[PDB]
Amino acid sequence: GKAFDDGAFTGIREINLSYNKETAIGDFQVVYDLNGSPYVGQNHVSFITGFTPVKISLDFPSEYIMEVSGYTGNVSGYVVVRSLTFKTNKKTYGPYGVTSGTPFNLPIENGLIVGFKGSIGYWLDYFSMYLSL
Amino acid sequence: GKAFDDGAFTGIREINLSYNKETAIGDFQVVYDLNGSPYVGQNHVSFITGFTPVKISLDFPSEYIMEVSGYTGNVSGYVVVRSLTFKTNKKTYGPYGVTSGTPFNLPIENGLIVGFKGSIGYWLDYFSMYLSL
Amino acid sequence: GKAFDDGAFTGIREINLSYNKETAIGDFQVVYDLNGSPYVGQNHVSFITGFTPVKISLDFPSEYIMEVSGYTGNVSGYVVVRSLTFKTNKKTYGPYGVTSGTPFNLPIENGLIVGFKGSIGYWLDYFSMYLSL
């Protein structure tokens, strides 16, 4: 897939992603906070279409992600991220996608997610997160 | 003066400031690096005019500030920053302004300056720096 | 169980833990690096016995943990950490314990594990990790 790296910011305001309940996660885009102002990150799109979009608007700065979880598995011979769930101090968003395969979860006790990087081909191949105090 | 706070970024690419050899530092503006791309910070201007501008273009990312020094003193009854000097791993820029008053200097052994905040009225009243690894 | 919190240090030199191939992880103790010198952390012991010990000596500072993985599951009605695996830039230590239940894994792209906290009763109830640059 095509690798992307948004880098690190001051916080997260909104997440826009798409999924297909039969395959995996597709598009991924984040609106970050940059020192008090919104900063629209680049839209990282799948090479294909047919995904269902969803918008996750956080009540920044009072609301923030405390845990990210999901599943990774094989789709058409490729290991990809099949589902994602975002748990904040207020609500739980998701799961989005297919909850099948190998689970993973990153609970944060102290700190914040301030950026994302990864790769998307037909689906989200992999992703990593920037953490800061 | 009017307080300003640019916040924190990924690095520094260019600094644009103005000074008057009879008084102190006036305008202050920084072009930061934001995850590999230039980010033009807001221009923080003096309430008055008559300053001499100067542009400090750094060879980012190979060149970075290793020490900031200057002088603070009274001008028309106000304590302000009268001069600034920026020393990088390649050159020394300045001193700009009047080298009279009380000196100060911040040498950095490990880390980087990634942001500025302060206040400007007729002159630069005070300033602080964001540091990060 | 009895909660423990070693806090944060400069790095990790050695890990001493015990496990039972029929149940879960028991004792946990770490020898940290504290500014160039070894610092022996407190031994956090299970309320019971019958565990098999193992010593993981790292070639500090050239060798460091890049990924921690394991399994959590029910044992006698309690959710505990049943197995742990430590992957460094040189070898893979483990898995130690029972590889049954729900998997989890924390790969580190940039940064270091510099401390542990958690709780141990009959078995390791849960644990968290301190991360730093």
Binding site: G118, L124, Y126, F127, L131 | - | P107, I108, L131
Partner: peptide, 15 residues
């Protein structure tokens, strides 16, 4: 270098 660093955890998914 003159570029700020941050802790990064991952990746999860394909290796």
């Amino acid at each position: 270098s003159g570029i700020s660093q941050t802790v990064i955890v991952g990746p999860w998914g394909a290796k």
